[PDB]
RNA sequence: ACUCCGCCGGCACCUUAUGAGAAAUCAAAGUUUUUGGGUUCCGGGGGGAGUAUGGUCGCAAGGCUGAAACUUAAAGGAAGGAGCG
């Protein structure tokens, strides 16, 4: 039984795609199959912004942000709850959630 | 100068924005669209809209018993026009939600066997249109540029979204049905006011 | 589609329904054939003779003015090359690939294309021998091919 | 007694409609089995084809329901097939008989060669499909008999077919699809446009339009 | 409560037959019908 | 259909779709038969009409609307309607 | 590549007829296609068809009337003597009362009923009913 | 347009205009000649009156060309 | 560079059945008992078995070609309105 029209990856009109290494376990996974999430958050957690802002040595200073691109294998994405098992009808929804 | 019955109706339909279509046109509605403007909106050919209204009226008058005609609307803007349309033409109006099995389940109280079915929008009234195809029930429907034509025998190209467009269309159709019965005098005028068909918000 | 690929292109010329020359074309058939012979003696081929006539003389189709195709006109004057133009260009391409391939032994892509070009040479040469446009014993030889062309 | 709930039920109850062909002509659904008993009732003849138990797995055990295949027909061009599932064998049979009547179709019959006597075979080559089962019927000469397996043969006899050649492909041991495929090609006998149907259509008023006044008046 | 809707009818209809605003494409649509002489129709 | 003598041997003659010319079978519940009324000089229904039958096939394709429009554009020019 | 222009012509008509089209274009045209259409036209299975000259091969537009159930070629074109026509009709035609097999004989392209009258055999082109 | 709302033998002159040159009922070229000394609209040669391109040759703003 | 209309070619996607299918599903896996456009390869219950043997290629690992005796009743695929069920 064929579960997905895309076969679980995103590859059309090409033979080979070089793999990436899972950010969690290091497993090799084709880049077009890996679950990718681009996390942008303040380098200082919200629980410490007040303290760090009070101790600032500059009248004005914008706290930088932390940019991290996370690439998971399927096993880690499911285990870490980055993605969840969806019903047969909901599997086709490709739009990101709210 | 004096305006013919067609020029007066087309003048009335222009004021109600009956000619303003959607930004998308179904391939089976292209024959009624006139031109597309740079805005992307399609303009319905009001000349053909009037002709289909006449054809629909000819089908309605041929029904010996008006109670066999059922006119309904799912969206609130048309729930007022259908009630008034059935008041003057003698049809049977069903405003609100259509109960599945009405045309097929012979044992439920709401069961009916209409000879004709009138609808305001095929896209929103897909249930009665789908169910009418199980009982040899022809259907008339007001169809916008992006309306599916499946199981629609007579499609009237018009704007079935605006509150004024829906009211005017049923007002003109009700007048045509009565004028073809000889109940009222010919011409583009009618003692009834069109505003009785427009949607009355709470 | 293409003989030696998966291409499915359809781009091509579309001849008009009017086979006669336009009313604004005043050049006569003897004048046109004089130019065709004049260009052939300069080394031009039938393909690039018609291009000059179309672009610089307003002659869309030589057959409409003269009633004969360019190659037929050249043959009547003994100016048709011994090797047909299209076969000549395939040999020239095969020579170019082989010359490139002698310095690039690891260019396996070129080695693949050389096989396709030479097989195209042999299919066309076979046809020309059947129609007697080439000598009956004519044979394509990679060793001596470069002497024929260029 | 019978209290019709449909327009056709009232007209048949009144007596305005007196033949199934008048209903078939307008392709009207028949939703009351008493209509069929009023038009071709006395000439019909039911026959249970098979009782098929089906099971649904449950926590406590397996729920067994019985599925009855019933064929009805007068042997003169009308045949019907009904299948009902019920918890009791008797209840399934009674409901299957009702379903068979509600699905009765007209079966067109023709002549193999010369048109001598009454029609005895199918008018053309006709095939029907259900699941993997395909049943083919080829016109046969008079006296050839019904060359078919038991399941198609029973249906063809009730339809009034006397002589036909048949062939099958697929899982005919699936009786449900075998009988349904046979019934499928019998209803296609009126769908094939032969040259004798090329004559232009002369429309007639439908029963609902002809008797609007009788239908307008409520029945009490 | 029928009077809330039925009897409610203003002295002036919401559909003004005069001063009808139309687009360039709409005017050309009426010309094809030969109805470019309507009183209300006027370009924006 | 007709025996060698002449007697009819069909239960009935099914209608043919006015657009596609297909036969309409007894179970084609998506097929509809439509009537278009005739008017007089004044424009009042005169009790006369033209009948059109459509098969479920064409209505399911969504081509009934255009088929009816063409069939009426021709018929009305023949019976004087306009 | 294009092997049988007749197959393309008849396949196009059969698909158009099932979709309920009134017209259909056949390209390329050939004198075999035209003579096959004429046999269908004489028996009232198609309406008026028109040949368009394009200086290359031509095109044909065929008017359909909804009477054509199916039309197809038989490939390869087997030889058919007069005595073997009966077997072919029992195979390709719905019944012994309508439907025609088109043959190419030395006397011209004709249906199998005309071939029996003239007592001439030939090769099968196609069939229709 | 729907298949039955069009006539294959008499298509609108605007529809055939936008069809591919090879897919019209009769093949017709989209090219033409013009005066300036005739020049082909899609000339592959450098005349500098016209500059060849992937399609129509780029003409010069200075001179005026007359189609013929 | 961007905006709008269109043509040809390409990787795909979305809706839909008038189609097909055991179904999953497929705009081709459609135009098939109403069976025929052209052509190549290839399958005939499950195992034994890609094994034995012979040949051939390879430095080798192995590749290509490739059985039988015998054994077995299954192995396997999909899973009023809607679905062949
Ligand atoms: K993925
Ligand atoms: K090219
Ligand atoms: K594209
Ligand atoms: K139930
Ligand atoms: Mg699994
Ligand atoms: Mg590619
Ligand atoms: Mg790979
Ligand atoms: Mg091609
Ligand atoms: Mg090849
Ligand atoms: Mg899909
Ligand atoms: Mg086969
Ligand atoms: Mg085996
Ligand atoms: Mg049920
Ligand atoms: Zn991982």
HEC profile for H4-66? HHCCCCCCCHHHHHHCCCCCCCCCCCCCCEEECCCEECCCCCCCCCEECCCCCCEECCCCCCE
How far apart CA F32 and CA G58 sit, in angstroms, is 41
Rg of chain B over CA atoms, in angstroms? 16
Closest CB from G20, G65, G67 relative to F19? G20
Same domain, G80 and G122: yes
Query: Is B2 contained in some domain?
Result: no
Which of G16, G23, G26, G64 best probes binding to H when mutated, by most H CB atoms within 10 angstroms?
G23
Task: Tell me: do G26 and G2 sit in the same domain.
Answer: yes
- d(CA F31, CA B137) in angstroms, rounded, equals 8
C102 and C71 assigned to the same domain: no
Distance D207 CA to ligand 9 centre (A): 66
**CA distance linking residue B174 with residue B192, whole number of Å:** 10
Residue keyed to tokens 């909804």: G66
**Which residues touch H16 (CB under 8 Å, ≥6 apart)?**
H24, H25
Rounded to the nearest angstrom, the gap between the alpha carbon of residue H62 and the centroid of all alpha carbons in its chain is: 22
Chains contacting B (3+ CB pairs below 8 angstroms)? D, E, F, H
Contact B88, B174 (CB under 8 A): yes
Indicate whether C68 and C99 sit together in one domain: no
Q: Which residue in chain B is spatially nearest to F72 when comparing CA positions?
A: B55
As given in the structure block, the two tokens for residue D179 are 């009988």
Selection from H8, B139, B129, G18 nearest residue F65 by Cα: B139
Nearest CA of chain C to the CA of H38: how many Å?
Answer: 5
d(CA A86, CA A94): 12
Shortest Cα distance, chain H CAs vs residue B64, angstroms: 33
CB atoms within 10 A of CB D136: 16
Q: State in Å: Cα A15 to ligand 7 middle.
A: 5
Question: In angstroms, how far is I31 C1' from G14 CA?
Answer: 8
User: Is H27 part of the contact surface with chain G (CB cutoff 8 Å)?
Assistant: yes
Residue A50 CB contacts under 8 Å (≥ 6 apart), including other chains: none
- Chain centre distance of CA B15: 18
Question: C46: Cβ–Cβ under 8 A, 6 or more apart, which residues?
Answer: C69, C70, C71, C74, C85
Q: Do C100 and C133 belong to one domain?
A: yes
DSSP letter at C78 equals T
Nearest in space to H38 (alpha carbons), one of A92, E38, A89, C22:
C22
User: Are the CB atoms for B171 and B52 separated by under 8 Å?
Assistant: no
Is G41 exposed, middle or buried, given 0-12, 13-18 or 19+ CB atoms closer than 10 A?
Answer: middle
Separation of CA A1 and ligand 10 centre (Å): 17
Whole-number Å distance between alpha carbons of H51 and H59: 6
Give the integer Cα–Cα distance in Å for D31 and D103: 9
Domain assignment of residue B126, given as a range: 9-202
Domain containing residue G48: 1-68
- Experimental determination approach used: cryo-EM
> Can you state the angle between helices D150-159 and D175-187, rounded to 10 degrees?
30
> Closest ligand to D83 CA?
13
Taking the C-alpha atoms of residue D78 and residue D24, their distance in angstroms, rounded to an integer, is: 11
Q: Answer whether G25 touches H (CB < 8 Å).
A: yes
Q: Determine the structural domain holding residue A37 and report its residue range.
A: 1-98
Query: Which nucleotide C1' is nearest A3 CA?
Result: I24
**CA distance linking residue B49 with residue B57, whole number of Å:** 12
Query: Which residues 6+ apart lie within 8 Å of A64 measured at CB?
Result: A42, A43
**R_g over Cα of chain G:** 14
Touching G: F residues 35-74, CB under 8 Å: 57-58, 61, 63
Do C96 and C139 share a structural domain?
A: yes
Instruction: Name the nearest CA neighbour of B168 among A84, E13, D205.
Output: E13
How far is C70 from C29, CA to CA, in rounded Å? 12
Q: Give pairs for D204-208: CB < 8 Å, separation 24+.
A: D204/D25, D206/D26, D206/D28, D206/F33, D207/D7, D207/D8, D207/D11, D207/D16, D207/D17, D207/D22, D207/D23, D207/D26, D207/D28, D208/B68, D208/B113, D208/B115, D208/D7
The closest of G10, G11, G69, G62 to G41, measured between CA atoms, is G62
Question: Within this chain, do residues C147 and C101 fall inside the same structural domain, yes or no?
Answer: yes
Neighbours of E10 (CB within 10 A): 8
Any bridge partners for residue H33, and if so which?
H40
Instruction: Give the whole-angstrom CA distance, residue F58 versus residue B153.
Output: 10
Q: Which nucleotide is nearest to C9 (CA to C1')?
A: I9
Query: What residue numbers of A does the annotated binding site for Zn(2+) cover?
Result: 22, 25, 73, 76
Our count of domains for chain B comes to 1
Residues of H in contact with B30 (CB under 8 A): 1-2
Residue B3 lies in a domain: no
CA distance E23 to E41: 10
Domain ranges of chain H: 1-68
Q: Which nucleotides of I are covered by protein (CB under 7 A)?
A: 4-15, 17-18, 21-26, 29-38, 77-82, 84-85
Outline where DSSP puts E strands in A5-97: 19-21, 28-30, 35-42, 65-72
Q: Are residues G73 and G58 in the same domain?
A: no
* Site of tokens 């299957």: D96
Residue of D nearest to G44 (CA): D195
Give the distance from residue C15's alpha carbon to the nearest chain H alpha carbon, in angstroms: 6
Asked, for residue C6, whether it belongs to a domain, the answer is no
Q: What is the distance between the terminal CA atoms of chain B, rounded to a whole angstrom? A: 41
Other CB atoms within 10 Å distance of the CB of residue A71: 18
C1’ I21 / CA D167, Å: 21
Residues at the binding site of A are 22, 25, 73, 76
CA D133 to ligand 12 centroid distance, Å:
25
User: Phi-psi bin for C58: left (phi > 0), alpha (psi -120 to 50), beta?
Assistant: left
Chains H and E touch (3+ CB pairs under 8 A): no
DSSP string, chain B: -PPPHHHHHHHHHHHTTTTB--SS--TTTTTTEEEE-TTS-EEE-HHHHHHHHHHHHHHHHT-SSGGGEEEEESSHHHHHHHHHHHHHH--EEEESPPPTTTTT-TTSTT----SEEEES-TTT-HHHHHHHTTTT--EEEEE-TT---TT-SEEEES--SSHHHHHHHHHHHHHHHHHHHTSS-SSS--SS-GGGGS----
My answer on whether G59 and G78 are in the same domain is no
Between CA D199 and CA F8 the distance in angstroms is: 14
* Contact flag D125-G95 (C-beta cutoff 8 Å): yes
Please check whether residue F30 is in contact with residue F44, taking contact to mean a CB–CB distance below 8 angstroms: no
State how far the Cα of F34 lies from the Cα of F54, in Å rounded to an integer. 8
CA distance H29 to chain B (A): 29
Chain H residues closer than 8 Å to C24 by CB: 68
The verdict on H2 touching B (C-beta cutoff 8 Å) is yes
Per-domain residue ranges of chain F: 1-82
| Residue C4 CA to ligand 3 centre (angstroms) | 24
Instruction: Give which of A84, A89, A74, A78 is closest to A22, Cα–Cα.
Output: A74
Sign for the CA dihedral angle at D13, D18, D24, D25 comes to: negative
Cβ contacts (< 8 Å) between H25 and chain G: which residues?
52, 54, 59
Is C2 a member of any domain? no
Whether C63 and C74 share a structural domain: yes
Cα-only R_g, chain E: 16
d(CA H25, CA H12): 11
Structural domain tally of chain A? Answer: 1
Q: Best interface-test mutation with H: which of G16, G27, G29, G54 has the largest number of H CBs within 10 A?
A: G54
∠ CA(B140), CA(B144), CA(B150), 5° rounding?
Answer: 50
SS3 of G42-58: the string is HCCCCCCEEEECCCCCC
Deposited resolution, Å: 2.5
């Amino acid at each position: 039984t064929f579960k997905r029209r895309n076969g679980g990856r995103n590859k059309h009109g090409r033979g080979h795609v070089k793999f990436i290494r899972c950010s969690n376990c290091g497993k090799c996974c084709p880049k077009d199959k890996a679950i990718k999430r681009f996390l942008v958050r303040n380098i200082v957690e919200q629980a410490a912004v007040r303290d760090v802002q009070e101790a600032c040595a500059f009248e004005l200073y914008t706290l930088p942000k932390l940019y991290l691109k996370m690439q998971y294998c399927v096993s880690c994405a499911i285990h870490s709850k980055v993605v969840r098992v969806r019903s047969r009808t909901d599997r086709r929804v490709r739009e990101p959630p709210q | 100068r004096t305006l013919s019955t067609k020029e007066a109706d087309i003048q009335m339909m222009l004021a109600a924005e009956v000619h303003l279509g959607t930004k998308n046109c179904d391939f089976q509605m292209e024959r009624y669209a006139f031109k597309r403007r740079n805005d992307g909106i399609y303009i319905i050919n009001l000349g053909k809209t009037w002709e289909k209204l006449q054809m629909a009226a000819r089908v309605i008058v041929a029904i010996e018993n008006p109670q066999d005609i059922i006119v309904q609307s799912a969206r609130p803007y048309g729930q007022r026009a259908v009630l008034k349309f059935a008041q003057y033409t003698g049809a049977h109006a069903i405003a609100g939600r259509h109960t599945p099995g009405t045309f097929t389940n012979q044992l439920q109280t709401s069961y009916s066997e209409p000879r004709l079915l009138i609808l305001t929008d095929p896209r929103t009234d897909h249930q009665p249109i789908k169910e009418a195809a199980l009982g040899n029930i022809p259907t008339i429907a007001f169809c916008d540029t992006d309306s599916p034509m499946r199981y629609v025998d007579i499609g009237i190209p018009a704007n079935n979204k605006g509150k004024h467009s829906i009211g005017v269309l049923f007002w003109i159709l009700a007048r045509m049905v009565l004028q073809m019965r000889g109940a009222i005098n010919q011409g583009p005028k009618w003692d009834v006011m069109v505003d009785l068909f427009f949607y009355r918000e709470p | 589609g293409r003989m030696h690929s998966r291409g499915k292109g359809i781009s091509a010329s579309a001849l008009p329904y009017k086979r006669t020359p336009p009313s604004w074309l005043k050049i006569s058939a003897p004048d046109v054939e004089d130019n065709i012979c004049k260009f052939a003696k300069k080394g031009l081929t039938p393909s690039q003779i018609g291009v000059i006539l179309r672009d610089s003389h307003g002659i869309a189709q030589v057959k409409s003015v003269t009633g004969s195709k360019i190659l037929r006109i050249l043959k009547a004057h003994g100016l048709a090359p011994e090797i047909p133009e299209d076969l000549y260009h395939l040999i020239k391409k095969a020579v170019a690939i082989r010359k490139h391939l002698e310095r690039n032994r690891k260019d396996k892509d070129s080695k693949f294309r050389l096989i396709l070009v030479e097989s195209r040479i042999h299919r066309l040469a076979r046809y020309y021998k059947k129609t007697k446009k080439l000598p009956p014993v004519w044979k394509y030889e990679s060793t001596t091919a470069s002497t024929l062309v260029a | 007694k019978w209290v019709p709930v449909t327009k056709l039920g009232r007209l048949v109850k009144d007596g305005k409609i007196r033949s199934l062909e008048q209903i078939y002509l307008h392709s009207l659904p028949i939703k009351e089995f008493q209509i069929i008993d009023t038009l071709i009732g006395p000439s019909l003849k039911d026959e249970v084809m098979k009782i098929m138990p089906v099971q649904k797995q449950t926590r406590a055990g397996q729920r067994t329901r019985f599925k009855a295949f019933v064929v009805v027909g007068d042997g003169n061009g009308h045949v019907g097939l009904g299948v009902k599932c019920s918890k009791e064998v008797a209840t399934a049979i009674r409901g299957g008989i009702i379903l068979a009547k509600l699905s009765v179709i007209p079966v067109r019959r023709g002549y193999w060669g010369n048109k001598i006597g009454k029609p005895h075979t199918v008018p053309c080559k006709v095939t029907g499909k259900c699941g993997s089962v395909t049943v083919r019927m080829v016109p046969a000469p008079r006296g050839a008999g019904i060359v078919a397996a038991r399941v198609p043969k029973k249906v063809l006899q009730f339809a009034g077919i006397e002589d036909v050649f048949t062939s099958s492909r697929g899982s005919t041991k699936t009786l449900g699809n075998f009988v349904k495929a046979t019934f499928d090609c019998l209803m296609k006998t009126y769908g094939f446009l032969t040259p004798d149907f090329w004559k232009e259509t002369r429309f007639t008023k439908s029963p609902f339009q002809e008797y609007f006044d009788i239908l307008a008046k409520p029945a009490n | 409560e029928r009077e809330r809707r039925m009897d409610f009818v203003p002295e002036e209809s919401a559909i003004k037959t005069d001063l009808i605003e139309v687009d360039k494409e709409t005017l050309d649509m009426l010309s094809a019908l030969g109805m470019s002489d309507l009183p209300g129709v006027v370009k924006q | 259909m007709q025996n060698d003598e002449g007697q009819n041997m069909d239960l009935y003659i099914p209608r043919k779709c006015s657009a596609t010319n297909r036969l309409i079978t007894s179970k084609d519940h998506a097929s509809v038969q439509l009537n278009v009324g005739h008017l007089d000089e004044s424009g009042v229904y005169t009790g006369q009409f033209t009948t059109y039958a459509l098969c479920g096939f064409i209505r399911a394709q969504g081509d009934a609307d255009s088929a009816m429009d063409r069939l009426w554009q021709k018929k009305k020019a023949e019976v004087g309607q306009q | 590549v294009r092997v049988s222009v007749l197959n393309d012509a008849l396949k196009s008509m059969y698909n158009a007829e099932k979709a309920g089209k009134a017209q259909v274009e056949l390209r390329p045209s050939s004198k075999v296609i035209i003579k096959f259409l004429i046999v269908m036209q004489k028996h009232g299975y198609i309406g008026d068809f028109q040949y368009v000259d394009d200086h290359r091969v031509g095109k044909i537009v065929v008017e359909l009337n909804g009477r054509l159930n199916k039309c197809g070629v038989i490939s390869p074109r087997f030889d058919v003597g007069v005595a073997t026509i009966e077997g072919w009709t029992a195979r390709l035609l719905p019944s012994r009362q309508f439907g025609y097999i088109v043959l190419t004989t030395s006397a011209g392209i004709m249906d199998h009923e005309e071939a029996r009258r003239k007592n001439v055999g030939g090769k099968v082109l196609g069939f229709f009913y | 347009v729907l298949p039955n709302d069009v006539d294959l033998l008499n298509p609108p002159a605007e529809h055939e205009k936008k069809k591919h040159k090879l897919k019209r009922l009769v093949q017709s070229p989209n090219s033409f000649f013009m005066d300036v000394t005739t020049v082909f609209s899609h000339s592959q040669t450098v005349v500098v009156l016209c500059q060849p391109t992937g399609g129509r040759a780029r003409l010069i703003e200075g001179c005026s060309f007359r189609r013929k």
